[PDB]
Amino acid sequence: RTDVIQALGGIETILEHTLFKGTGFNSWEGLFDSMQFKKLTHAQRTGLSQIPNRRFTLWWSPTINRANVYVGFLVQLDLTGIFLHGKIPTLKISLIQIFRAHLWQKIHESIVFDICQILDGELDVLQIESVTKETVHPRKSYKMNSSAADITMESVHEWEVSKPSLLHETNDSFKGLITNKMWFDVQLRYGDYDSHDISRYVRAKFLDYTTDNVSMYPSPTGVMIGIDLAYNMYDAYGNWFNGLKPLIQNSMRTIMKANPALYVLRERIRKGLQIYQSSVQEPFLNSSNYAELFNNDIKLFVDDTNVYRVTVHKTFEGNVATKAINGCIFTLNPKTGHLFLKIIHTSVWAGQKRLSQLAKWKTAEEVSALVRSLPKEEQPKQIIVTRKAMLDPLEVHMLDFPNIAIRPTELRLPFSAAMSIDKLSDVVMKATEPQMVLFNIYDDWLDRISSYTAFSRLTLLLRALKTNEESAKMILLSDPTITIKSYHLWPSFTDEQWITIESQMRDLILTEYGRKYNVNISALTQTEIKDIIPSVKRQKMAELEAARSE
Amino acid sequence: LTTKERKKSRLGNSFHLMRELLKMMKLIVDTHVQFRLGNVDAFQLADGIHYILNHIGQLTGIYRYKYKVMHQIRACKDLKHIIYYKFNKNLGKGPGCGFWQPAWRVWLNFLRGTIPLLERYIGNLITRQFEGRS
Amino acid sequence: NRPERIQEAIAQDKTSVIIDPSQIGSTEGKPLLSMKCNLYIHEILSRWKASLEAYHPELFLDTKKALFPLLLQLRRNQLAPDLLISLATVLYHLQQPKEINLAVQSYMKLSIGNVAWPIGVTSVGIHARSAHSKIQGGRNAANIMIDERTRLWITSIKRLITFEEWYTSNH
Amino acid sequence: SVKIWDTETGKVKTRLHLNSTPADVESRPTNPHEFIVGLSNSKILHYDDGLVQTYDHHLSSILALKYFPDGSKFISSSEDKTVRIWENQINVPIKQISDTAQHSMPFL
Amino acid sequence: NIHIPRYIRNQPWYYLVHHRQLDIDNNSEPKIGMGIKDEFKLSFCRNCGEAGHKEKDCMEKPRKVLVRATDDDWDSRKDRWYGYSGKEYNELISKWERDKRNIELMKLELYKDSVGSTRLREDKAAYLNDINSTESNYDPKSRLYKTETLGAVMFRRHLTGEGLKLNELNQFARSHAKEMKEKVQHVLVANPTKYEYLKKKREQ
Amino acid sequence: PEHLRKIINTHSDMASKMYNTDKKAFLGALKYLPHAILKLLENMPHPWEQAKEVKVLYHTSGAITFVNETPRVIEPVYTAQWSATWIAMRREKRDRTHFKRMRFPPFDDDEPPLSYEQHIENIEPLDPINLPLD
RNA sequence: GUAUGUCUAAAGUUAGCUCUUAUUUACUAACAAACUAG
Ligand SMILES: O=P(O)(O)O[C@H]1[C@H](OP(=O)(O)O)[C@@H](OP(=O)(O)O)[C@H](OP(=O)(O)O)[C@@H](OP(=O)(O)O)[C@H]1OP(=O)(O)O
Ligand SMILES: [Mg+2]
Ligand SMILES: [Zn+2]
């Protein structure tokens, strides 16, 4: 195999065929089915065999979908601008798999509006009147027959724009053309093993789309930026006036390094090829950075366990079919204390199937709608998800919000027991429209104590409701004197009554924890908090090196 | 689509073969139109036509629904391989060649073959549309 | 010409803000309800001019720029029915002491409300069923984020909600 | 059209102009507000003193309704053989009652 | 870092480093716009008299030089605009120059002092204001840009204020655990109001 | 020709009841469609000529448009005309520094095909591939 | 999860035993820890 690798041209000539360059790897060296054991169906094992064929085809996809084709008709993918050279099925399924949710468009639009921000950042430098966002066609991001102008610059004083040159030409001619109006057109292409030279491509598309007898652009002067997605490349061809060429060079290196749209593309090519090397910058929640939650910023939890809840019932023939009941999205702000409880009505699921993944995408849609309703001075500077599978839809629907620090967690935060609470269950089930019901979790809890006390109280109460439900409900509903006010959730206890309730809930949690896992006691304090609510070994090292130094 | 809208919306080799020959003819006529409008040169018309008649298997997609077209496609490729090395003795490599005559003959001989084929196929299809299935 | 319109509409500006909760459902009084919804937002901004010295001196000009279309579209009855009814529901829940949470609930019936799938997930997954087209919307009962300029004042409404919370809190 | 008539005067409390021919129209024993109208387009509409909450799980025209001791739940049966116990303003049935030999449950 | 197998670490017979000659290296910098570097390299005839060719391949009509070449790749080879002196673009410049030669509610709505006359478009994420070259002062996975305010250098955030107050609180919980059922109540989030009011009492 | 052109222009709406039998004619003309394609591509205009005014049969309903005549050319004249275009295209590949090949397909998928009388008939055609004969 | 199947007023046709209640067992579920169908 060593001489096979040396005979295919080393590692470079192998990986030029592959989709390695489209993935984001800091080095090549970090490149290196639990469903078949489930009783499902004799026929469904065919799809189980189908699954790794997809990653084999996607790994060799630039050399399978390449342009040196003896005979082959250039069809287009569904809803993206990837041109197949023949109806190859698994390649087409893998390219639907990566480029779902109009991610191609959510690349294109994103880059376009990010250039807008740069041109809104650099107005006075280039003497720009008004960077005009153009209302473009909804299918403009993949119409490759002809295009239009994404961004149109207007100028105050007219511009001495050059003859068309690349982004990286060292000598230009700032004398020739004279216009008061640039434009910009971001292009995207899935480059393959043959047609991946991006400068030739963007020069061909710029000299193609200006030079039509049909007119689409407001001026013949513009810059057409083309990003090659499948080879991590970029180039911009067109007319350059003074100060725009280093600006667009630095801007394209900045975008191509750190666009969240391009990086969700790279993450999907990584996870679609089942390869990963993780260096988690600003890590997930632990018992170490547990107070990273309400560090006086604006933030929201997103719980998505009870979005798609079901009730099953027998259905006249023997099968037990599965109806979708009214669900919730438990959006908790820990610091200020609101609760953007989204009530998902059954009319969300009008004739839809594969409701689980579609529920994850609907939860991401509602979080994006909630954030878009908020101002950009109340746009939450981080979002803590609760489940790992939430990260793939949410990082797409928050592509419009690059300010927001999407963080995973490694705490099983017991917000799934929200249906155990009576009034949350009432406002979940009693709905006609898909409603946004609000609460304060912290209702009697913000005249006396801050967010830390009662967030830990809420964690204790909700883990007790999730562990043993009606026992903790009888502990809440013990003293018939202490009632619940109409806009509160929890009973209006005094503080020693809250100490009694918290002590009984903690004893309930650890009682059923011992009666489930027959473990004696927590032999460590952070282990006990971790049991109530990777870096476990790091906090072992931290307490070993901090409890010894006294 | 549904599956019911994928069963009625699949069609045979006949309808698609009509569709691909009309793709071919429309490429021919649209390059002559791009000439006649004044956009493109006559030399660039001849190279565009010789590009059509030697990339029918790429520009159109007739190879899918009738595979003996590959014979003519191979012959067109083979005529390409002759003509680009008698047109370019002292010219090297590049577009500009537009001696489209024998590939044009090859596609006309293909049409000579599949006039009665398409007559019988589309006669059976159109009589299923009007008269119905026997 | 124009200064007589200034005189007339400022003498009308100084001539009620308490929205009758019968007049919210009373669709016949749509111009009067739209004018009251205009003038109570003017009263919010007049209060926020006064306490600007210690609460966000950077967003007052931005909200004045952003409500200019809503001030355009409320004085001469230029809005949608459900949009105006939900806005009046907000501004009626914005005049009561403890109804700030009900004010933001009315805001979240304004911003999203009745319509399921507000943005649209737009053909996720592989299979893309035939019913899977009705769960995306660019138009045809998708949201009321149908414009930059429209959503701009919709956002400014909850800016004034947050100011109303802070203003009734520290007084 | 569903009309709520006083037994003492006989005045107009509500006039429910509906879409379908309504089935039996019943009331929850706790509240005079809480008020359930069966339809024949497979739906049931709960009301107050004015729509409150729909009910759509029967496939056929709904024939007859009941409640529990002092209400707090609800019983529905249709031209299908199914009987569904719904709750106080909850769409989801606790039990749906069906076998292969049942004709229907037209009254109960 | 042996994720490399045995056969890749096994070198060829003569002389990790022998592979590193797309790049195998860094690959997280997105690659440059390289491009249209072009080159044009270069008996007798009965018809014209010139040497090299015969009458069957002469280029003048029968009377009684620079080449698109130096090719290795495919995208260089097709290249509809390979040679380029700007002819068609200057023609369209000339066509464009020929074509180039040829109310009160605004005043009513200034009752408040404005006398001026799918994402937000005013977001400007702090990688866009990081437009000058830094050593990745942003990550797009967590979508968290580092500053000196709530940022460190493997690292965490600055727990500022409330986070520092909970640092005081769980160090107080550790002090009450390392000083003083009750075996379980020694920690903060176990019995939170207990240690919260003990820390409130401690400030008296 | 204007009678033919008016028939083809009146069959762009095709929404009245009167087109019913005419629409029958369209589905019947598909099994005579591909023959007409050969009758285009035989009578395809050569590079030395601008536009070849050709005889053609049209159905009364304008269903199918069979180009009528067959292209007969004298054999030595035919190979001399194609050799003149051969030498002319060799000269205009050599002396031309940049050759621009056509776009394919020349029009968009959304664009309808253009009418001859409003866009092509009023523009005079260009100069064809002709060697300068001394 | 498909194939596929089924329902859907806008338009008005003339005069020992009965019982509550829990444990166990069996068959089923695209219900949970982004993808799999004849
Ligand atoms: O890839 P190559 O082996 O170098 O051959 C190519 C190829 O011809 P093939 O179809 O036989 O592979 C090109 O055809 P396409 O890539 O377009 O299908 C053709 O270019 P054109 O068809 O556009 O003319 C070109 O010929 P040339 O570049 O000389 O015009 C010719 O190169 P060779 O002449 O070296 O065989
Ligand atoms: Mg089968
Ligand atoms: Zn010679």
Cα–Cα distance measured from residue B127 to residue B129, given in angstroms and rounded to the nearest whole number: 5
Coil, strand or helix: which one is A153?
Answer: strand
Cα–Cα distance measured from residue A368 to residue F124, given in angstroms and rounded to the nearest whole number: 58
Cα–Cα distance measured from residue A76 to residue E156, given in angstroms and rounded to the nearest whole number: 45
Cα-flanking dihedrals φ and ψ of residue D87, to 5°?
-110, -175
Residue A20 token pair:
């390695």
Specify the nucleotide whose C1' lies closest to residue D20 (CA): G9
Residue A451 token pair:
């967010």
Strand F56-58 relative to strand F65-67, pairing: antiparallel
- Determined by which method? cryo-EM
Residue A138 in contact with partner chain C when CB distance is under 8 A = yes
Cα–Cα distance measured from residue A371 to residue A380, given in angstroms and rounded to the nearest whole number: 7
Deposited resolution, Å: 3.7
State the Rg of chain A over Cα: 28
* Chain B closest-CA separation from residue F106 CA (Å): 6
**C1-171 CATH fold:** RNA Binding Protein, Prp18; Chain A (1.20.940)
Least Cα distance to E172 among E132, E150, E203 occurs for E203
Coil, strand or helix: which one is A38?
Answer: coil
Segments making up each domain of chain C, as ranges: 1-171
Residue E3 token pair:
């994720």
Cα–Cα distance measured from residue A546 to residue A524, given in angstroms and rounded to the nearest whole number: 14
Residue A382 token pair:
């981080």
Q: Which residue of E has its CA nearest to C63?
A: E114
As for chain F, the residues directly before each break of C–N over 2.5 Å are none
Where does ligand 1 bind, in terms of residues with CB under 6 Å?
B 77, 80-81, 84, 93-95; E 77
Tell me if E74 sits within 8 A of A68, measured CB to CB: yes
Number of alpha helices (DSSP H) and beta strands (DSSP E) in chain E = 6, 0
Coil, strand or helix: which one is A76?
Answer: strand
The residues, ordered by sequence, that sit 6+ positions from E32 with a Cβ below 8 Å of its Cβ are A168
How would you list the strands of the sheet with A299-302, edge to edge?
A299-302, A382-385, A405-407
Q: Cis link prior to A218 (omega < 30° from 0)?
A: no
Residue from B56, B59, B84, B85 whose mutation best tests the ligand 1 pocket (most atoms within 8 A of CB): B84
Whether C118 and A364 lie within 8 Å, measured CB to CB: no
Tell me if A329 sits within 8 A of A366, measured CB to CB: yes
**What DSSP element (H or E) covers A499?**
helix A495-517
Q: Which of E111, E113, E114 sits opposite C10 (nearest CB)?
A: E111
Least Cα distance to A476 among A515, A429, A531, A420 occurs for A420
Residue F98 in contact with partner chain E when CB distance is under 8 A = yes
Q: Which of D33, D59, D92 to mutate to test the interface with A (most CBs of A within 10 A)?
A: D92
Distance of CA A404 to the CA centre of its chain: 11
Cα–Cα distance measured from residue C132 to residue A100, given in angstroms and rounded to the nearest whole number: 13
Cα–Cα distance measured from residue A244 to residue D43, given in angstroms and rounded to the nearest whole number: 65
- Give how far Cα A456 sits from Cα of A119, A462, A514, C100, Å: 46, 10, 21, 26
Cα–Cα distance measured from residue A543 to residue A399, given in angstroms and rounded to the nearest whole number: 39
State the Rg of chain F over Cα: 19
As for chain A, the residues directly before each break of C–N over 2.5 Å are 32, 533
Protein residues within 5 Å, CB atom, of ion ligand 3: E 45, 47-48, 58
**What DSSP element (H or E) covers F77?**
helix F75-94
Chain G footprint bases within 7 A of protein beta carbons: 1-5, 8, 27-38
Specify the nucleotide whose C1' lies closest to residue A359 (CA): G34
Q: Cis link prior to E62 (omega < 30° from 0)?
A: no
Residue nearest to atom 15 of ligand 1 (CA): A68
Residue A167 token pair:
């982004």
- Neighbour-count burial of A417, counting CB atoms closer than 10 A to its CB (0-12 exposed, 13-18 middle, 19+ buried): buried
Give, as one character, the DSSP assignment of residue F11: T
Cα–Cα distance measured from residue B48 to residue F105, given in angstroms and rounded to the nearest whole number: 10
Tell me if D98 sits within 8 A of D54, measured CB to CB: no
Residue E175 token pair:
């002090």
Residue A494 token pair:
């005094």
Residue A550 Cα to ligand 2 midpoint, Å, equals 73
Cα–Cα distance measured from residue A159 to residue A167, given in angstroms and rounded to the nearest whole number: 18
Tell me if B92 sits within 8 A of E68, measured CB to CB: yes
Cα–Cα distance measured from residue C136 to residue C150, given in angstroms and rounded to the nearest whole number: 20
Residue nearest to atom 36 of ligand 1 (CA): B81
Cα–Cα distance measured from residue C128 to residue B6, given in angstroms and rounded to the nearest whole number: 13
Contacts of A260 in chain E (CB under 8 A): 140, 143
The residues, ordered by sequence, that sit 6+ positions from A518 with a Cβ below 8 Å of its Cβ are none
**What DSSP element (H or E) covers D27?**
strand D25-27
Least Cα distance to C123 among A393, B121, A154 occurs for A393
Specify the nucleotide whose C1' lies closest to residue C126 (CA): G35
Q: Which of E57, E68, E80 sits opposite B92 (nearest CB)?
A: E68
Cα–Cα distance measured from residue A112 to residue A358, given in angstroms and rounded to the nearest whole number: 28
**A305 CA – G4 C1', rounded, Å:** 33
- CA torsion sign for A73, A78, A81, A87 is negative
Neighbours of F16 (CB within 10 A): 9
The residues, ordered by sequence, that sit 6+ positions from E154 with a Cβ below 8 Å of its Cβ are A283
Cα–Cα distance measured from residue B128 to residue A26, given in angstroms and rounded to the nearest whole number: 62
Is chain E touching chain D, with at least 3 CB–CB pairs below 8 Å? Answer: no
Residue from E68, E76, E77 whose mutation best tests the ligand 1 pocket (most atoms within 8 A of CB): E77
**D53 CA – G10 C1', rounded, Å:** 28
The residues, ordered by sequence, that sit 6+ positions from E186 with a Cβ below 8 Å of its Cβ are A525, E173, E176, E177, E180
**What DSSP element (H or E) covers A223?**
strand A223-228
Give, as one character, the DSSP assignment of residue B93: B
- Amino acid identity for residue A124 in this structure: D
Whether F99 and B95 lie within 8 Å, measured CB to CB: yes
Is residue B9's beta carbon less than 7 angstroms from any atom in nucleic acid strand G? no
Q: Which ligand is nearest to the CA of A46?
A: 2
Strand A223-228 relative to strand A184-189, pairing: parallel
Tell me if B99 sits within 8 A of F86, measured CB to CB: yes
Cα–Cα distance measured from residue C66 to residue A213, given in angstroms and rounded to the nearest whole number: 41
Residue A75 in contact with partner chain F when CB distance is under 8 A = no
Positions 46-65 in A, CB within 7 angstroms of strand G:
46-48, 50-51
Cα–Cα distance measured from residue F56 to residue C158, given in angstroms and rounded to the nearest whole number: 72
Residue nearest to atom 32 of ligand 1 (CA): B93
Specify the nucleotide whose C1' lies closest to residue A323 (CA): G31
